[PDB]
Amino acid sequence: MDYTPHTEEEIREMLRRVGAASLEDLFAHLPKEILSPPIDLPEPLPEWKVLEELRRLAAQNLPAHKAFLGGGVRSHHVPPVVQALAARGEFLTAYTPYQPEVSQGVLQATFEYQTMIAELAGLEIANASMYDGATALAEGVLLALRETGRMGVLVSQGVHPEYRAVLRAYLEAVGAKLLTLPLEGGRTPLPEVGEEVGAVVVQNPNFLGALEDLGPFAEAAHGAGALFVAVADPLSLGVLKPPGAYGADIAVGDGQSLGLPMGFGGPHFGFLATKKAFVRQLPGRLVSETVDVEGRRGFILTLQAREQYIRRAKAKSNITTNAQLTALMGAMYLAALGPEGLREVALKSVEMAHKLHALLLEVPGVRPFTPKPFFNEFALALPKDPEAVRRALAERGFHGATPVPREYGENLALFAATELHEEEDLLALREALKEVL
């Protein structure tokens, strides 16, 4: 089946009007050798059949709703009101707002998103969104290096390993140097920052769920003329002192925790907030308030010299398509919950995580790893291989024990909890873990 409206008579007339003998004739000027390629694709299926096949694939999976898996993505409540609004055809099918007069819906929404992210991070400005947390970090650091003009980077090992891997790729591409600061007792020790360092990166809560004291890191960075980049889960900012209050210059993170569907890893969005004083080095789209000829408030994309269309080779980044729709879902989530609503959700996930940790401490052979205080995720040392444990847990119908790479220690596994977990869920998981061990 297909979506083209053309009837046979319309096709005949159009072909005649353009001087083509047939549809195949429209391609007659391409080199004969590349025509008629041997493409093998399954035969077309009507929409109800396509859905049947999807459901069959879905039926093969074990849904992760209420999963205890962590590592950057958690099973938080996805509010139907948010999804209903983000499903509005105008938001869903609009293109980047280059014709402001008819795009105030998206423009204003983006401006509001920027405001909320800035507030959440305790900073002054934010771009219209990045692809995800990892790429946001890479762009945030590159921003810091362009601003300071240096090439050195210190990154805590407490930063999610995948984030650090992406960061390395972007860094080495531009010739920058990266040094990793190993964790000690689950936390990162204050490093000595040299004048060759342009950025210091630390995540809070860190990968193992541990809370880190950012204050001294910001001072250390500034003392050397380096910028401090903080990686922080947005939901946690609902109750934890934001990097902005610690003196951080740039803040980045992934927005999945803001009511976004897990979607097996994507798509979600990344945020990048910083000081207005660094706006020149800021990558991505930026919306500014303005006015129209009659004095009506309006919004529009601004300072586009930082982008590819105008700056091309000297653009701050090559980013074109961003993560607007999902960023908007995050904004809707923040608006739907408000300051106290967000704080409650954050506190609740922390409460449940702490209750789970207490319960899991009774499992034979299990040892705590992540030190207190930790947020809504924590790592435990298991008496069996984490991958083996996750698998066995799955066989019993439970999603838990997110394997922690050995660079952090042996047999480590992350566990997380959210506002949708109740006492009975924690007990059920523990029994499952006891059975597995």
């Binding site: 096949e53 401006f111 969104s129 790729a169 591409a173 097996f264």
Partner: protein, 473 residues
């Protein structure tokens, strides 16, 4: 007029209430770690939230409401079927046991197979989050290739045509490469002479779209491939214009070594007002070892994520890619099939050429008009600026095409109607385009008039930028 969500707020007002019994913060978090000053988020009830965002959507247009002939964007219909398809996989965690995510992994593998089949590539990564991300991925792949050949310090330049999308050269810089722009010929295609003049051991790669940004197919693509091959230059395929040739021709058969696709363009993934998207990257066998990790492979136990690749460039983003977007693209291909995709490409091209004939009839000019493919670039008659005509279309209830791109055509009107738009719609658009030429200069220069907002003070926005409601700093 329309209030900001922040103006709708009321001190202490509550919206969603997701927690029955709220714990005391200090029983869970050490004081010095607790936020003292709450973030200034909106404080609104759910009804207010709904009215706000529903109201915003009504101050917005999209494919669902308007014909969007945006060249280089492929604004085709986004089937509602796909949104239903995506919600079917919403509850999956990327770190859940792979043995419990075989449905998701299978869909990723199959999509990878369909995309390789359509592009003629040998291996593929569905990880990059957008076309430009795919560009960075492919260029770093090419870079790893040269370095692995001991030519890392000599191969330092990336070639791009003068008609290339800004992301191409921007990507070279991100990849640490220098970039040289080659001029196009009198027909709008690659100038072979200028190309042979730039090709050398110092060139890492050549980035091209085919058809190019003028909507013209590079008839000497095979020659271009030959020249690049003998010079050891990798040929990169910016797959943004794949809609024009889906199922009819494959970049791989043209000699391209690496390619990136835009699912949010060619394969119906919704544009979402800017994003998110998906930029899969396919490559020939000799570049496969440098692909970012992980790749989706099919084993005898089932499907799995493959991280065992020593020459990989590494990771370009978290997890495995924008899966929900991949679901959309898979559904699209499984619905249309090869014949469906071919018909789509043919009609996309037919609509473009047809509309081109209608506009020329109205007085519009086409500087480079060989057989137009999925799009074409016109110019208004002398005296009219694209900018004003675009604003005139807005007033008439239409959306303008892409304007002032490619950069090699003054007052450029890059038109791409796509295959899902009807004949009568193309004609109505052409009629509006023609009518605007009969409008007095002043009416045009002051349009729009009826839109929710008229032309905006762009100067003010750039000189005195107000980037947040609280405009701090």
């Amino acid at each position: 007029s329309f209030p900001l969500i922040f103006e709708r707020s009321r001190k202490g007002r509550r919206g969603l209430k997701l927690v029955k019994a709220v714990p005391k913060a200090e029983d869970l978090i050490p004081k010095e770690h607790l936020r003292e000053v709450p973030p200034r988020l909106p404080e609104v009830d759910e009804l207010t939230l709904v009215r706000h965002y529903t109201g915003l959507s009504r101050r917005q247009v999209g494919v669902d409401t308007t014909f969007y002939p945006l060249g280089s964007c492929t604004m085709k219909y986004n089937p509602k079927l796909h949104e239903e398809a995506a919600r079917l996989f919403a509850d999956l965690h990327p770190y859940q046991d792979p043995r419990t995510a075989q449905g998701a992994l299978r869909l990723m593998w199959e999509l990878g197979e369909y995309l390789k089949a359509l592009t003629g590539m040998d291996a593929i990564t569905l990880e990059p989050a957008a076309g430009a991300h795919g560009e960075l991925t492919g260029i770093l792949i090419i870079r790893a290739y040269h370095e692995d050949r001991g030519e890392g310090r000599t191969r330092r330049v990336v070639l791009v045509p003068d008609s290339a999308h800004g992301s191409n050269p921007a990507t070279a810089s991100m990849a640490g490469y220098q970039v040289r722009e080659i001029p196009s010929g009198p027909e709008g295609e690659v100038d072979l002479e200028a190309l042979k003049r730039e090709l050398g051991p110092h060139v890492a790669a050549l980035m091209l779209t085919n058809p190019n940004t003028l909507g013209l197919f590079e008839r000497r693509i095979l020659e271009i491939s030959r020249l690049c091959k003998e010079a050891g230059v990798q040929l990169y395929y910016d797959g943004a214009n794949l809609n024009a040739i889906m199922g009819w021709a494959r970049p791989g058969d043209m000699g391209f070594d690496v390619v990136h696709l835009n699912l949010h363009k060619t394969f119906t993934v919704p544009h979402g007002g800017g994003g998110p998207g998906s930029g899969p990257v396919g490559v020939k066998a000799h570049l496969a070892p440098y692909l970012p990790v992980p790749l989706v492979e099919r084993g005898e136990e089932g499907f799995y994520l493959d991280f065992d690749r020593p020459k990989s460039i590494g990771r370009v983003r978290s997890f495995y890619g924008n899966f929900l977007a991949l679901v959309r693209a898979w559904a699209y291909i499984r619905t249309l099939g090869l014949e469906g995709l071919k018909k789509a490409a043919a009609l996309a091209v037919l609509n473009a050429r047809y509309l081109k004939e209608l506009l020329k009839e109205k007085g519009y000019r086409v500087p480079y008009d060989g057989p137009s493919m999925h799009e074409f670039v016109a110019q208004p008659p002398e005296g009219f600026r694209a900018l004003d005509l675009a604003k005139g279309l807005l007033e008439l209830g239409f959306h303008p095409p892409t304007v002032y791109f490619p950069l090699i055509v003054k007052e450029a009107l890059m038109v791409e109607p796509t295959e899902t738009e009807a004949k009568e719609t193309l004609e109505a658009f052409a009629e509006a385009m023609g009518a605007l030429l009969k409008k007095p200069k002043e009416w045009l220069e002051n349009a729009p008039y009826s839109t929710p907002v008229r032309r905006l003070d762009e100067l003010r926005a750039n000189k005195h930028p107000k980037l947040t409601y609280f405009d701090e700093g």
